Design a protein around this ligand. Structure first.
Ligand code: PC1
Ligand code: PC1
Ligand code: NDP
Lengths: 110, 297
């Protein structure tokens, strides 16, 4: 309840600052301008490399999603199994990074 | 004729045109292109300004060194008017407002300021005077704008008898309030008939009224080549602009049909051929857009 009141107050203050930032210089009657880039009129060239770094982020973020409950996972009574599977998850993240390395995946955005 | 005011040069920037002009109301829409066209000949252009000197910056590249003199003036101060016109050989009046303010109404802007400018210009010995009225100025008209502008036309005629009064219909350009009004309105269709005139045609008409000695004491009506209805004009403006502040006096003047005065001379009697709307409407409305032309009558 207090969290939502805090979030609603933050959103209200942000909306108020944006509204003042868009309306206060529009109070000026400055001038209506006539005749309002490096590339002129080309289309956006698709870079495969930027898509590759975004997908590599998404997959490593899923591996991180597996990694997150470790501060609770250390509290278990099966510590050999927990330690093995924790090192196995971090090792599979390392193997994913190593395969990303060795197949020219991290090139020109290394 | 004084020696310093004989024309010299090939009519360029650094020449002397012999026109020593005072342009009242030069910090607006017509005074902009008029001071451009006078300064490209080499005229001494006195620009009396009422506003902040920041708002007269765009007039400064329009002439050569020393050719534009900015000086302060109040409309209700005859001393400032005499201080501005006592060296001119032509005075152009362009003071106008689409809206009436707290200190100035349509009466003071369209009657008192033009009559005081014309009377002080008469008693300062200025040879020529150009007054800018509206085509639809009428005493019995529905809008207070056109009523006070017809009265001010009458007073400018009676107190400066050799004045050159010019009647534009509805001027369109980049900084207008005619096509940019219709493009930003996003008011309705009627049987109102208009013929808009392009601003460079009006400005060449005012120059040719300065230069022609036969334009003294005459009255000119500057209209465009094509009479349009209101509805097909407004839909054409929304079509060129790729589209699916106001007051009631402006709306009553938009719905005022542009009268036809064939007994008054126009642009063709000053050597100006009126540019049609279909050449310049994309130049005006290219800013608004993120085509079959309009029907004439
Ligand atoms: C909260 C964080 C800080 C926010 C900013 C600081 C607080 C103060 C905010 C208000 C400052 C003053 C108004 C804005 C600046 C005006 C500048 C300007 O050009 O003014 C002339 C303008 C326009 O003058 P104009 O109509 O002559 O137009 C000039 C342009 N020509 C001639 C070319 C058309 O005036 C206004 O816009 C008036 C705005 C309101 C004035 C103050 C009212 C009371 C405020 C309390
Ligand atoms: C590659 C796989 C590496 C990890 C192998 C399992 C390591 C481990 O500790 O397993 C014991 C763990 C847990 O055994 P545990 O002996 O710890 O069980 C204790 C009982 N509980 C959990 C209820 C407290 O896993 C198993 O015994 C079953 C799952 C794995 C079965 C074999 C999979 C082989 C896959 C080959 C490919
Ligand atoms: N489409 C049109 O605009 C048409 C215009 N006309 C006439 O042509 C003239 C100019 O029109 P336009 O350029 O379009 O309009 P603007 O409003 O753009 O220009 C008006 C000019 O007059 C000045 N001015 C206005 N009120 C006062 C005042 N009370 N005291 C001193 N200066 C004042 C303004 O200066 P500032 O910015 O400092 O206030 C500005 O320089 C007017 O006489 C108008 O009636 C005729 C037909 C059509």
């Amino acid at each position: 309840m207090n969290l939502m009141i805090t979030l609603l107050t933050n959103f209200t203050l942000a909306t108020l600052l944006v509204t003042i930032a868009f309306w206060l210089p529009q109070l000026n009657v400055y001038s209506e301008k006539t005749s309002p880039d490096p590339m002129g009129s080309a289309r956006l060239p698709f870079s495969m490399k930027f898509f590759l770094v975004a997908i590599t982020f998404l997959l490593f973020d899923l591996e991180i999603a597996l990694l997150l409950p470790l501060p609770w996972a250390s509290q278990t009574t099966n510590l050999n199994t927990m330690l093995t599977m924790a090192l196995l998850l971090i090792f599979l993240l390392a193997v994913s990074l190593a395969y990303e390395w060795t197949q020219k995946g991290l090139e020109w955005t290394e | 004729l004084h020696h310093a005011v004989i024309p010299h040069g090939k009519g360029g920037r650094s020449s002397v045109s012999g026109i020593v002009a005072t342009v009242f109301g030069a910090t607006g829409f017509l005074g902009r292109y008029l001071v451009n066209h006078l300064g490209r000949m080499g005229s001494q252009v006195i620009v009396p300004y009422r506003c902040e000197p920041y708002d007269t910056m765009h007039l400064r590249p329009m002439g050569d060194l020393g050719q534009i003199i900015f000086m302060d003036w109040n409309g209700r101060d005859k001393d400032s008017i005499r201080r501005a016109v006592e060296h001119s050989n032509v005075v152009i009046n362009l003071v106008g407002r689409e809206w009436e303010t707290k200190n100035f109404d349509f009466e003071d802007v369209f009657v008192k300021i033009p009559q005081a400018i014309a009377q002080v210009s008469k008693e300062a010995g200025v040879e020529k005077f150009i007054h800018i009225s509206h085509l639809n100025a009428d005493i019995k008209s529905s809008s207070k704008y056109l009523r006070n502008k017809a009265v001010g036309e009458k007073e400018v005629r009676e107190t400066f008898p050799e004045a050159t009064i010019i009647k534009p219909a509805d001027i369109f350009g980049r900084e207008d309030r005619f096509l940019n009004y219709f493009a930003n309105i996003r008011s309705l269709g009627k049987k109102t008939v208009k013929q808009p005139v392009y601003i460079v045609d009006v400005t060449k008409g005012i120059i040719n009224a300065i230069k022609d000695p036969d334009a003294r004491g005459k009255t000119f009506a500057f209209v465009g080549p094509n009479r349009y209805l209101l509805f097909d004009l407004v839909q054409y403006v929304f079509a060129v602009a790729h589209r699916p502040w106001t007051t009631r006096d402006k709306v009553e003047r938009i719905h005022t049909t542009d009268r036809t005065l064939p007994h008054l001379p126009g642009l063709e009697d000053l050597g100006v051929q009126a540019t049609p709307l279909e050449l310049k409407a994309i130049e005006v409305l290219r800013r608004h857009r993120t085509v079959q032309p309009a029907k004439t009558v």
